[PDB]
Amino acid sequence: MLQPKRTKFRKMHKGRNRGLAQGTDVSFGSFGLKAVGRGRLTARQIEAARRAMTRAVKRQGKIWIRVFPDKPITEKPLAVRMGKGKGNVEYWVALIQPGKVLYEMDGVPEELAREAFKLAAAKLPIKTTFVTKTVM
Amino acid sequence: AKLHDYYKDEVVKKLMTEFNYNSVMQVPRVEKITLNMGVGEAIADKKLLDNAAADLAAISGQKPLITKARKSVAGFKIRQGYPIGCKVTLRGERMWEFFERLITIAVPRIRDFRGLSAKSFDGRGNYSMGVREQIIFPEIDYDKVDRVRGLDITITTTAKSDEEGRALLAAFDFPFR
Amino acid sequence: SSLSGGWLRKAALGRALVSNPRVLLLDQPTNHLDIETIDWLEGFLKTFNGTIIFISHDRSFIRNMATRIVDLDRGKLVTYPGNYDQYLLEKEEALRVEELQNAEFDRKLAQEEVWIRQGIKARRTRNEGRVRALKAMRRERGERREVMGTAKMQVEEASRSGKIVFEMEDVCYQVNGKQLVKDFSAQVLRGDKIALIGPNGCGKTTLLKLMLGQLQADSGRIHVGTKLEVAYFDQHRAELDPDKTVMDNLAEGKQEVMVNGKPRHVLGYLQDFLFHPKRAMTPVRALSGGERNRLLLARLFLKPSNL
Amino acid sequence: GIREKIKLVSSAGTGHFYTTTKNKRTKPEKLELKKFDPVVRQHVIYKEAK
Amino acid sequence: MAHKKAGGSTRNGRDSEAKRLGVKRFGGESVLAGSIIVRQRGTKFHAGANVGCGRDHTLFAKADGKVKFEVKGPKNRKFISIEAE
RNA sequence: AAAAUGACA
RNA sequence: CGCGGGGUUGAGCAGCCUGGUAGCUCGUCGGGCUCAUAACCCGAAGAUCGUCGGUUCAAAUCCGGCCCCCGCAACCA
RNA sequence: UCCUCCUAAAGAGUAACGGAGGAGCACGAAGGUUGGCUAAUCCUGGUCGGACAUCAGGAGGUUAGUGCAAUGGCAUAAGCCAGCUUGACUGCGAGCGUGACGGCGCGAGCAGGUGCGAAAGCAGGUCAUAGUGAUCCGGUGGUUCUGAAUGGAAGGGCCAUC
RNA sequence: CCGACUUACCAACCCGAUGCAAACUGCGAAUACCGGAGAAUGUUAUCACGGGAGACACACGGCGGGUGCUAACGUCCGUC
Ligand SMILES: Nc1ncnc2c1ncn2[C@@H]1O[C@H](COP(=O)(O)OP(=O)(O)OP(=O)(O)O)[C@@H](O)[C@H]1O
Ligand SMILES: [Mg+2]
Ligand SMILES: [Mg+2]
Ligand SMILES: [Mg+2]
Ligand SMILES: [Mg+2]
Ligand SMILES: [Mg+2]
Ligand SMILES: [Mg+2]
Ligand SMILES: [Mg+2]
Ligand SMILES: [Mg+2]
Ligand SMILES: [Mg+2]
Ligand SMILES: [Mg+2]
Ligand SMILES: [Mg+2]
Ligand SMILES: [Mg+2]
Ligand SMILES: [Mg+2]
Ligand code: NA
Ligand code: NA
Questions:
Q1: Residue C275: C-alpha distances to residues C152, C267, D46, E52, E82 (Å)
Q2: Residue ranges of E strands in chain B
Q3: CATH class of the region D1-50
Q4: Cα–Cα distances in angstroms (integers) from residue B128 to residues A40, B120, B151, C131, in the given order
Q5: CA of A43 and C1' of G31: distance in angstroms?
Q6: Which residue range is the domain that position B66 belongs to?
Q7: Which nucleotide has the shortest C1'-to-CA distance from A73?
């Protein structure tokens, strides 16, 4: 499910999502899925976009997940008045800036890679794109 | 003592000519004989250290320094400050005088003796040793005894590596296997 | 520095009487005396012209000499009329009734804590004339525990000793003036319980010293048992330094007492002897006479012993 | 709140006292400290009291 | 009808007063004697020439002058000193 | 003083 | 989606009350009594104290998160 | 009510039934000085003895420690040990900091006596920040300050304290 | 006892590469704040003392945030 084991503090401030990304370049595999939009990418969209990648090439190559949620999101229950504390933790999300390589793959031909990546992007709430490793 | 007068000119020349030494100090010298037993089971009785301390004092003519627990350990059921063992460090004539009696009138009384182990070295040319029984010394009466107290003797030398640490002890007739 | 325990006590009863006091305060007068000394002292004090206050644990000395009797139970002292056996009867009623009312107070406080955490209901308030009273009941529980606690004890049996513990024949030890033991011949076997009795200063304490080899027999030789684990209780305690802490004197300055089967106990050995765990660093000199007697008793029953 | 307040009455006769605390269940001994006595303006021995 | 739902509590929510620590006389200020320069909790600034340190590690002037901030020392630990004016 | 019970053929 | 209490060898229950101590009765096993079974007598075994952490030298006990259960409260329109 | 951190926007301050923990103490040494010393952890060798006890030498360099939370500090140690000790003194205090005030705090230096050191010196409690309660009323000790005609006394005042 | 041994694994520590953090920092601005000097400008705009007050229910808009669902003409702070 990609939820952290043994964090330090349970709840965390909302924060903001400004600036560009850091993992801009393909480093482990040979093809990668780059993000063009901004948003928060939960832990279940990571999995549902990893089933849609494994089940496409069906056995071959390695799939790398470059991102990890490590960020609690809290939600008050239904029909609660405001205050009286902070909401109990529900799920974990990872913050995404433009230019961040989310998944990346190795050992699969490029044309098979494009269709495999086109099926994972359908499960993510951000406009992604297909990128190719360069010598750099 | 009666071994130092031998070393200062003979063991020097038995090693200067052997290991190709141009200086009387590139040859190693043995500088101290630390000696201690960890009584450990003194949790039941303090007399298990009050009488045990008189055993090192009866071998080495020096009153032992009681050691203590450095860090609390739950498994052994001790905490900081317990007296759990006595220790003696010998230097000088008392180092050589004890060195004489151990390798002459104490080693040959070890039960089931088949040489001295040679692989017990710590990469820098120091020797460690155990005895498994303290009655091998001519200072134990067999009537003042109540347990089977052993010892750990760690000859500490200035040799730069193990392979010449043997030479320092071998030149003293050390019964290496 | 030479007299026996009975004679040393006699000297302390004289030094407190040279002044011829109008008020005689005798803390434990009959401790190491024999029947003859106690019999004589019961007439010395009766004739004594002044006034006597004394603390005695002799249930037979008290009856012969006690005009009035005083409790000093738990910070309050109350008197009693009649002979000595009256006090035992009247005190037991004081303990029973106080036990009877103590349980009733807990009964109210028990059912006043089911009510504090009960549900409120619809629009009610939970009177604070009862919450504050419960606050006063919980605060009042910092009170005296009426039963001191009947201190519980248990011994540490060890492996059986040799069938012969002590054997001494032809042994004849004599102090300068008079003979204490003259040509003794006796044996002490396993599981034999022996009581040394006699007059004052007749060698009871020194006889044990011969057995343990404290001092050497003049002649005759003594042979000791072969698997003995002696536990020794001296006349004058002398095995506790009065300044060392209570915890360290008990079990020789170490934790991890051995109780019953295996050493799974530490410092809980005090709770069996009604030592509060808070007062564990008290120097031994501060303790009362009876408290110090039990503490020396506690650490003898703390180690394996055949003797 | 084990510690109990005490005062050290001067042995120099002049009515004077410092006050302090003392753990009475672990310190059966009575303090005897040398401290200033401003009435006599000398360092005297102060012994425990109420 | 179930209109108003019960609500929980917060286990925390207590804090303490602010101690107003910091530097009271910045560099280049002509300051008198015995006055306070910087309030500390440890010793982030050490005591240089003509200044002292209280039990609170408060740094105070000893003689009048100007305030100097400097970084002398093998471990690059900051000092404060006062000149002679 | 205590002393209960035992498939059918 | 708020409040109290509980979870301890096969069963029931103490020990949580200011932290070092795991026990009581029934049961289970092995002998004995009886023609045999009950009852009786004499001896043993059996628990990581719901689970995951955190302080403490030391946690069944103190603190936090979850899992199961049981009571209680959900009022004024 | 009090202490520590974040929110708090690089001086100070700054709210919420915001996110996390603590205190109502301890100590005649755990305080003052004068000497001396330097950890965690892992590797190798060694009687029982081990994953973890004591010991020896290597790497490492404070990841250790601090009477008890967190933060800031600490090798000149503020941590560890020992000798001698009572400055855990009396009267004051330039000049500052922080509060609406009540108040709270830091303080060179002056005088009187004292401790340690050969001295230069340091010492007006504890590495710092929590460990706390106004006034009124009353109790105890000291002090001719007052004393309802006068001499006392009572009762008030001032100082120390409950 | 020895592990005599295979390894789809639960994984310390180290090595090379790649990310995250309000309660992490071996780095680190813009602004703001404190003090000093200078000209120009401003019918003292500064401070102290004294007489008289009112006010202590704020609202929205921009920027930086806590909470809420980066909901609310929501709520609570900083600055304008
Ligand atoms: N240290 C000593 N020096 C000299 N005489 C001594 C010493 N100890 C004991 N004695 C003497 O030895 C005799 C026996 O003394 P001990 O202590 O054995 O008495 P005891 O029989 O145990 O009597 P009690 O019941 O009175 O204590 C006495 O006469 C006593 O005075
Ligand atoms: Mg039936
Ligand atoms: Mg600030
Ligand atoms: Mg700012
Ligand atoms: Mg200290
Ligand atoms: Mg020093
Ligand atoms: Mg100190
Ligand atoms: Mg402190
Ligand atoms: Mg008059
Ligand atoms: Mg008066
Ligand atoms: Mg108002
Ligand atoms: Mg308002
Ligand atoms: Mg407002
Ligand atoms: Mg509004
Ligand atoms: Na005697
Ligand atoms: Na007594």
A1: 11, 10, 34, 52, 62
A2: 30-37, 65-68, 83-90, 127-130, 152-157
A3: mainly beta
A4: 63, 6, 11, 73
A5: 65
A6: 1-177
A7: I69
